[PDB]
Amino acid sequence: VARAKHREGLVVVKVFSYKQELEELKIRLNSAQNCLPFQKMLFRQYVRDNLYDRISTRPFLNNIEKRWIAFQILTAVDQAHKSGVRHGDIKTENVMVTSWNWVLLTDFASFKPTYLPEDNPADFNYFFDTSRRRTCYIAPERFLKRAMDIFSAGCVIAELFTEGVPLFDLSQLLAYRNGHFFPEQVLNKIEDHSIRELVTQMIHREPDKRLEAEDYLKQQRGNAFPEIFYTFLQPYMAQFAKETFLSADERILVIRKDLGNIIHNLNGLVILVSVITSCLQTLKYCDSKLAALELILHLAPRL
């Protein structure tokens, strides 16, 4: 693995049939705006931050932003499975958070195996153990299915809300699978009881109980994930998930034009600011800078 550069962008390159499968993700997940498979030795776009780093940066994800990121993680789970795609290996190190809080689910593991012999940890150490933090979120049944992923997404949410503390290491996960262990300390660390219940339900030991990500979204519609996420932010934020406003000037102008509607619905304003500033630090024409300053003045009293 190593970063590189491109004529008009940045890239990340890894060095080690399958090619056809990678392009299948390019088409399917082109509709899925919160996903980013191998665009091409494998090459893809270099995203600003990862989940772990983003947790450990001076801008500190609040509860509102963490809930939004969990919502978008579930949204990516749906978008992936609907098209006929299963991550296989979800974890904090593979959920890239762009500079404007647009969660992208990357590194779709189609090369990793499905079953792990429980008497030999060599496979885990060679394939899955990369960050070497010893955190393991592999589905207990495996020792693919939407069930095998929703579990990983729930574990990731619990880790995210615990400020980097893991729900299971390898030993803790193996003990949990055996039926003689339950992380009551990590589940007690969760900020909100609602996402605590979300993690508890998502991580049912027996796979058959686990629901779909769509249903888990549906139940949370009331209090866990506010309705504003479902109705307004999901479509409106999708405009910048494409090449329509590559220029910061256009982004600032569009956001200024739509400020009347945005304030009507949105609070989610934290995402709006995380959108505006990335445009701020690159503007070129004076009119764009003045418009951005006017936007900042408009948002200030509401924040």
Add this chain to the structure above:
Amino acid sequence: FHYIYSCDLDINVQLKIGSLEGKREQKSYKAVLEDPMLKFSGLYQETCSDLYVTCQVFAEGKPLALPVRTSYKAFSTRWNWNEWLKLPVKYPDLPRNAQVALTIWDVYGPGKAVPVGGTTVSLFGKYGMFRQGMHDLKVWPNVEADGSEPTKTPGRTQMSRLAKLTKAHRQGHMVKVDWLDRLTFREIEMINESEKRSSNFMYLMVEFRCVKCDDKEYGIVYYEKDELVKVPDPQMSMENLVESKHHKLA
């Protein structure tokens, strides 16, 4: 066609206050009866009053600098300032829709002033060019020169036809004849005089810096000097300013 950009030309914008030509309306007897202060007002004095014309540059409805007065000058039979005011703003600092408000003032009583008019003429006219020559702005009565955009006291609206044609004549675009235009120009002068006479409003004349240190032939024009990767990222490699703020503080 030669020109110098507004950005490069770094000097102070100058304006000449010419002569306020017009007739000033008065009130009835009951007004002075109820408010005796009007008797000592400037307008009720037999000779022309010692008016002074302030000027302030506006933009987007926001004042851009302090106003500028006219040095005291006595008047006997006419309002003829003929003074070259210097404005605080410079050419490179004038936005596109900059407009110069010009308010006339007169005494009303000890320690009080009362506006006797107000005019607002855009600086950068059509095609983004600095207005030059000798423009005669209109005068809205008893209202301070309004700077809001759009203005509620605009300065300049067969007279219009001749206004355009005269311009095309001196920009080279016309047929060439000497005697005919020598007489027609006096004709237009008389027509403009009659049109001004008919109009009930006043009319404040004003001139821009048509002649400067540089050749007069030049004109001023508005100007300024500003599939590996699919998902946009407009701040991929910059400074983390919040990180710097936290590092500096403690």
